Structure 1
Amino acid sequence: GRFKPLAVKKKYAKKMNQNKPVPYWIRLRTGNRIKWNEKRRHWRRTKLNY
């Protein structure tokens, strides 16, 4: 609901900023192994519980 402390809000904001796909040019680098993020999180699959 409405209430949360600011520190909790900032932790949730960092997770929101992290939840993104790999930019395409990263796959073109010499000797690259990254294909997908593999740390993607969906709100309805795994809980953070902050």
Structure 2
Amino acid sequence: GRFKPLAVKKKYAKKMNQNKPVPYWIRLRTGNRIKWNEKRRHWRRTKLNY
């Protein structure tokens, strides 16, 4: 609801920033191995719980 501590709010903000896909030129770099993010999170599948 409305109440949360500022420390918890900042942790949630960091997670929101991390939840993004890989930019396209990373795949064009030389010797590249990354295709998908593979650390994507969905609010309905896995819970952070903090």
| Bucket of the pairwise TM-score, normalised by the shorter protein | over 0.9
- List gaps (5 residues or longer) in structure 2: none
Paired residues, number: 50
Deviation at 1:27, TM superposition (A): 0.1
Deviation at 1:29, TM superposition (A): 0.3
Deviation at 1:4, TM superposition (A): 0.1
Deviation at 1:44, TM superposition (A): 0.1
Deviation at 1:30, TM superposition (A): 0.3
Deviation at 1:19, TM superposition (A): 0.1
| Cα deviations by residue, 1:1-50 (Å, 9 ceiling, x for unpaired) | 00000000000000000000000000000000000000000000000000
Query: Identity over aligned residues, as a percent?
Result: 100
- List gaps (5 residues or longer) in structure 1: none
User: Take 1:3 and 1:34, find their aligned partners in 2: how far apart are those partners?
Assistant: 39
RMSD: 0.2
